[PDB]
Amino acid sequence: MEAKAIARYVRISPRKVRLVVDLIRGKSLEEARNILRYTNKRGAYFVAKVLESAAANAVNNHDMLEDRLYVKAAYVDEGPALKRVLPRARGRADIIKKRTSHITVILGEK
Ligand SMILES: [Cl-]
Ligand SMILES: [Cl-]
Ligand SMILES: [Cl-]
């Protein structure tokens, strides 16, 4: 038994969020919660939100015991890009792509 949760279109580049999910991969739920709470890394709040959503799914929808949960999988996929329009530059269009993040957290039982 395992419980999943996903957060889409997070406005943070995948690279930065990956640095965050890397800290919690394989940890117990309690440990992951603390790491997220005290980490200085940008995007920690979004991963924390997905973590709690997965915990709510495991405990309330799948009746799993909260004290047995650990982060079985946590990863970030590249989501759709946002094409930010910049002021004209030397007569030309200036468009830069800003990538969003797709975050997945899967909780399992030890
Ligand atoms: Cl997405
Ligand atoms: Cl990843
Ligand atoms: Cl990659």
CATH number assigned to the domain comprising residue 70: 3.90.470.10
Q: Pick the ligand that lies closest to the CA of residue 101.
A: 1
**What gap in Å lies between CA 101 and CA 80, rounded to an integer?**
8
Distance between alpha carbon 67 and the CA centroid of its chain, in Å? 22
- Domain span including residue 40: 2-110
The pocket of ion ligand 2, defined by CB under 5 A, consists of: 18, 75-76
Q: Pick the ligand that lies closest to the CA of residue 19.
A: 2
Q: How many A from CA of 89 to the centre of ligand 1?
A: 31
Q: How many A from CA of 67 to the centre of ligand 2?
A: 25
Neighbours of 48 (CB within 10 A): 19
Q: How many A from CA of 6 to the centre of ligand 1?
A: 9
**What gap in Å lies between CA 88 and CA 86, rounded to an integer?**
6
Resolution to one decimal, Å: 1.9
Domain count, the chain: 1
Helix extents (H) in the chain: 14-24, 29-38, 44-56
Token representation of residue 109: 């039982």
Burial state string for 10-35 with b = 16 or more CB within 10 A and e = fewer than 16: bebbbeebbebbebbeebbbeebbeb
Q: Pick the ligand that lies closest to the CA of residue 25.
A: 2
Give the count of alpha carbons within 13 A of 71, CB side only. Answer: 26
Structure-solving method: X-ray
Q: Pick the ligand that lies closest to the CA of residue 76.
A: 2
Token representation of residue 62: 């799948």
